[PDB]
Amino acid sequence: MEYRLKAYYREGEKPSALRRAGKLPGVMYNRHLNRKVYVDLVEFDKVFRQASIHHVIVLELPDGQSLPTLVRQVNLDKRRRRPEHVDFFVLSDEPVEMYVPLRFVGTPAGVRAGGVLQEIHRDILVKVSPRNIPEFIEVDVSGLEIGDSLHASDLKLPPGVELAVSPEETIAAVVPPEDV
Amino acid sequence: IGRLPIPVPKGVSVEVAPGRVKVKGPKGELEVPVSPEMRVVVEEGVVRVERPSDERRHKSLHGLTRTLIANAVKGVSEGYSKELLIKGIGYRARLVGRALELTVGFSHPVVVEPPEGITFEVPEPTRVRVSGIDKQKVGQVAANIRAIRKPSAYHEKGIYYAGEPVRLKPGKAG
Amino acid sequence: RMKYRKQQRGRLKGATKGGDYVAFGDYGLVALEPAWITAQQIEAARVAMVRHFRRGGKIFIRIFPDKPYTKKPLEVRMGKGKGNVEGYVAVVKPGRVMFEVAGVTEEQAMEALRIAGHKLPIKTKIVRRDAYDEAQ
Amino acid sequence: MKVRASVKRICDKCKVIRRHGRVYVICENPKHKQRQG
Amino acid sequence: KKVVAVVKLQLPAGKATPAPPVGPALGQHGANIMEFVKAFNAATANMGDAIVPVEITIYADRSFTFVTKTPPASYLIRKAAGLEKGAHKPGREKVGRITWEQVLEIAKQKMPDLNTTDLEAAARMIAGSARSMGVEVV
RNA sequence: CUCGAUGUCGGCUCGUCGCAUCCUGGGGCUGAAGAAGGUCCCAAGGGUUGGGCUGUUCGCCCAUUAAAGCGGCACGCGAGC
RNA sequence: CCAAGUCUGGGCUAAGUGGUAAAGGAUGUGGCGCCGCGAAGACAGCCAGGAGGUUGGCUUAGAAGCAGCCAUCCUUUAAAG
């Protein structure tokens, strides 16, 4: 879940004094419906932190509007970490732009295979699924070596079958230590 | 919650004089010093260390006056003698009044002048050490005599306090 | 280092910030308060990692030998055509994304960097992915 | 052993002791007397 | 100088006096090469070609030898298995492989000097230490 | 700053400070047993030879030594040779 | 020293930082976030075991952690190196 505080005083001098207190600027967005609302960090963070809370929405409590939202953008702070601006979207039935967390296992057949190792390339999938996307879409293949790599092709799709990204472009692959 | 608990057994003279907490027991008028804010109590059977704060200085201080004055106590209780064992194939030890005998490095005249609470116990002398008053300076003089010709990590021989399981390093080739 | 077949002689002088911040394996090596950085040196860190890594699980990369440095003379006097392209290195100033893989899992990847970096030329730091990354 | 620099203990038990503004690391192994102050 | 201690040894059953493991080891460490050796003979006489282990000392029971006990895990493993020394590399070589049944069984059999005692326990010990060698389960 | 002038090498005579101390003492460390060594730390006290070849400073060598230090002041010194 | 508070108020240093310096070292000091817990009664102190197939790999002359490159299973509880 998530909760924030409205941005009456918005856009500039505000965002700054914001950072000051420990509140970083934020946007509440839905099709052409927006509110310059402002972020209390400490927790804003804990939350974002879940990361699960970054690939998959949570419920926003603003004034009294327990509604559904995820993040699409975040000017994250050049000069170190912590961002400079957070952006969310509240949904209905049709959520296409889906960056679903994707977990997998090259079913250990790489390291204890050719010493070789595994490089996670995609990790997540921006496909389609109506506010009904699993927090963990997943895939596997005990092939983790040779001139070996795997992609969106093989992929292996869940209940919400819809690839909004490309026709196989490498989920990831295995490269050798000093080779095998 | 603890750095202050100490009783004052035996009608030991335990009282505040000029910034000096006087601890008199077996003639030993040990001086357990007194810092401005420290301060303690002399009640029934317990003497207690108190703290006007608890930053580094005061807390450490607490541990101090508490434990050191404690010393004033157990000390006045008995009288403080330091238990030491000299021991070296090339070494000897005998009192002879007010003097350190000792010889482990030829040309023998190791004649001393035991400070105060000090006196010499020549029980062997492979067993032989010092007796004092104020637990503190006896340890110091003890170490004195100790070090003056003592060590030997590769071949033992010296003066060994208790003798802490003295360590030693090999010789040449064998 | 690398930076084969240029186009030009030698750039010049400036520096202020940049644009690398993401990750690529979670063996996060990030500059902080620099400027130039000798390709050579770079390798230095490169190797460092490479061997610490029980010799194998191959790291990644980040920056490049970027630009052409000239001390021009030899010790001379000055006013020649400032010739000589003696050195090659990167220009990273605002903590840049220096990222590289093996499979240490913990303070060993840590050490590896820690060292490679200590090694490099400046007050800098390191980490892991804390703000995923979205592409098209 | 003196080295106005570094000193990061070592000898497993090797101790870091504050002493008169000096970082003097002390171990029960002579082999580490880390003096740098 | 003379520090007593029962000598734990792995040796060439059938033989008795393996230069390195019983000459130096026993004799100087706290035992005796050839004498403990002929006692060895007394025993190893019918155990000697998959290697034999015994701890020998001058101990209670008022005597010299001590305890003969099942030729250590991994080793008797390859032993019944079918290979000479060690398969040079375990895991990253996945080339020595044995099987379920014959495994758990051989376990049952060697079971003597076996901690506690359990069918699955000994079998598992086999798969595991066997792996330790290159005697992996497959 | 210097060309209406600041006599640039070496040596000589006279030196005077610095330590990053050669020798000295005081040191922990050792892959220190002794003896003697190597290795840092502490500290200028005084001490820091003669010849040869070279205008050489430097250097190589002869014989020494406890040692045979490095370097500042226009690479100190022509109103002193 | 010379004009004008040895003003008041709330910190924070104690080295004299102020009276140049970095790379870099650290139970320096004072301020905030996560992890185990003192009633699954804490940590150092301290008792006591200091588990059985572990003593699996080239090199074994010797790895059988207390040589070095390949493991990372098992038995089994005081627990699990």
Phi, psi of C80, deg, nearest 5: -75, 180
Letter string b/e over residues B136-166, b meaning 16 or more CB atoms within 10 A of that residue's CB: bbbbebbeebbeebbeeeeeebbbbbeeeee
| Largest Cα–Cα separation, chain D | 24
Sign of CA dihedral C81, C86, C88, C91: negative
Q: Is D14 annotated as a binding residue?
A: yes
Letter string b/e over residues B42-75, b meaning 16 or more CB atoms within 10 A of that residue's CB: eeeeebebebeeeeeebeebbebbbebbbbbbbb
Residue nearest to nucleotide G53 (CA to C1'): E73
Apex E31 CA angle, E29 and E34, nearest 5: 120
Q: DSSP 3-state assignment of E104?
A: helix
* Distance (Å, whole) CA B62 – CA B49: 6
| Interacting residues of C128 by C-beta distance below 8 A, sequence separation 6+ | C23, C26, C28
Chain E residues within an 8 Å CB radius of A112: 91-92, 94
Residue nearest to nucleotide G60 (CA to C1'): E20
Chain A residues within an 8 Å CB radius of C56: 115, 176-178
| Interacting residues of B101 by C-beta distance below 8 A, sequence separation 6+ | B92, B93, B94, B95, B110, B111, B122, B125
Phi, psi of A27, deg, nearest 5: -120, 135
Q: DSSP 3-state assignment of E75?
A: helix
* Distance (Å, whole) CA C26 – CA C126: 10
Apex B155 CA angle, B150 and B159, nearest 5: 20
Q: Which residues of A touch C (CB under 8 A)?
A: 51, 54-55, 72, 74, 76, 78-81, 83, 99, 111, 115, 117-119, 123-124, 126, 175-178
User: By the 8 A CB rule, do B14 and B73 touch?
Assistant: yes
> Does any CB of chain A come closer than 8 Å to the CB of residue C56?
yes
List the single residue in A with minimal CA-CA distance to E93.
A113
Q: Which of B115, B133, B159 is nearest to B25 (CA)?
A: B133
Domain ranges of chain E: 1-69, 70-138
Q: Which of A2, A179, A176 is nearest to A86 (CA)?
A: A2
DSSP E strand stretches across B25-108:
29-33, 40-43, 46-49, 85-86
Chain A residues within an 8 Å CB radius of E92: 112, 115
Domain ranges of chain C: 24-132
* Distance (Å, whole) CA E55 – CA E6: 7
**Exposure on the CB side of residue E21, measured as CA atoms within 13 A:** 18
**Peptide bond before residue B125 is cis, with ω within 30 degrees of 0:** yes
List the single residue in A with minimal CA-CA distance to C18.
A78
* Distance (Å, whole) CA B33 – CA B40: 12
Q: Is D32 annotated as a binding residue?
A: yes
C-A interface (Cβ pairs under 8 Å ≥ 3): yes
CATH topology of domain C24-132: Aldehyde Oxidoreductase; domain 3 (3.90.1170)
Q: How far is CA A34 from the centre of its chain?
A: 21
Q: Answer yes or no: is E79 CB < 7 A from strand G.
A: no
User: By the 8 A CB rule, do E53 and E72 touch?
Assistant: yes
Does the domain at E1-69 match CATH 3.30.1550.10? Answer given as yes
* Cβ-based burial of E5 (10 A; exposed 0-12, middle 13-18, buried ≥19): exposed
| Interacting residues of B79 by C-beta distance below 8 A, sequence separation 6+ | B25, B26, B27, B28, B117, B131, B132, B133
Which of E89, E92, E137 best probes binding to A when mutated, by most A CB atoms within 10 angstroms? E92
Q: Which of C96, C95, C33, C91 is nearest to C67 (CA)?
A: C91
Q: Answer yes or no: is E90 CB < 7 A from strand G.
A: yes
Q: DSSP 3-state assignment of B55?
A: coil
User: By the 8 A CB rule, do A124 and A108 touch?
Assistant: no
User: By the 8 A CB rule, do C23 and C85 touch?
Assistant: no
Q: DSSP 3-state assignment of C63?
A: coil
Q: Answer yes or no: is D8 CB < 7 A from strand G.
A: yes
Phi, psi of C87, deg, nearest 5: -120, 160
DSSP H stretches of helix in chain C: 39-52, 107-119
User: By the 8 A CB rule, do A106 and A143 touch?
Assistant: yes
Pairing of strands A172-175, A149-150: antiparallel
For the segment 118-157 of chain B, residues whose CB is within 7 A of strand F: 153-155
| Interacting residues of A9 by C-beta distance below 8 A, sequence separation 6+ | none
* Distance (Å, whole) CA A98 – CA A133: 8
User: By the 8 A CB rule, do A45 and A105 touch?
Assistant: no
Phi/psi region, residue D33 (left: phi>0; alpha: psi -120 to 50; beta: rest), is: beta
> Does any CB of chain E come closer than 8 Å to the CB of residue A112?
yes
* Distance (Å, whole) CA B19 – CA D15: 37
C58–A176 C-beta distance less than 8 A: yes
CATH topology of domain E70-138: Arc Repressor Mutant, subunit A (1.10.10)
- Measure Cα distances from E28 to D33, E34, E55 in Å: 38, 12, 15
Q: How far is CA B123 from the centre of its chain?
A: 19
What is the number of other CB atoms lying within 10 angstroms of the CB of residue B24?
14
- Measure Cα distances from A90 to A68, A70, A115, B112 in Å: 5, 7, 46, 92
User: By the 8 A CB rule, do C32 and C123 touch?
Assistant: yes
Structural tokens at position C25 = 């394996």
Q: Answer yes or no: is B167 CB < 7 A from strand F.
A: no
Q: Answer yes or no: is B44 CB < 7 A from strand G.
A: no
> What are the percentages of helix, strand and coil residues in chain B, rounded to 5?
20, 20, 60
List the single residue in A with minimal CA-CA distance to C100.
A119
User: By the 8 A CB rule, do B116 and B132 touch?
Assistant: yes
Q: DSSP 3-state assignment of B70?
A: helix
Phi, psi of C47, deg, nearest 5: -60, -60
Structural tokens at position A79 = 């000069």
Q: Which of A51, A81, A56 is nearest to A68 (CA)?
A: A56
Q: What is the DSSP string of chain A?
A: -EE-EE-SS-SSHHHHHHHHHTEEEEEEEETTEEEEEEEEHHHHHHHHHTBHHHHS-EEEESTT--EEEEEEEEEE-TTSSSEEEEEEEE--S---SEEEEEEEE--S-SHHHHS-EEEE---EEEE--TT---S-EEEE-S---TT-EE-TTTT---SS----S-S---SEEEE-SS--
Note the strand F nucleotides within 7 A of protein beta carbons.
Answer: 28-34, 40-41
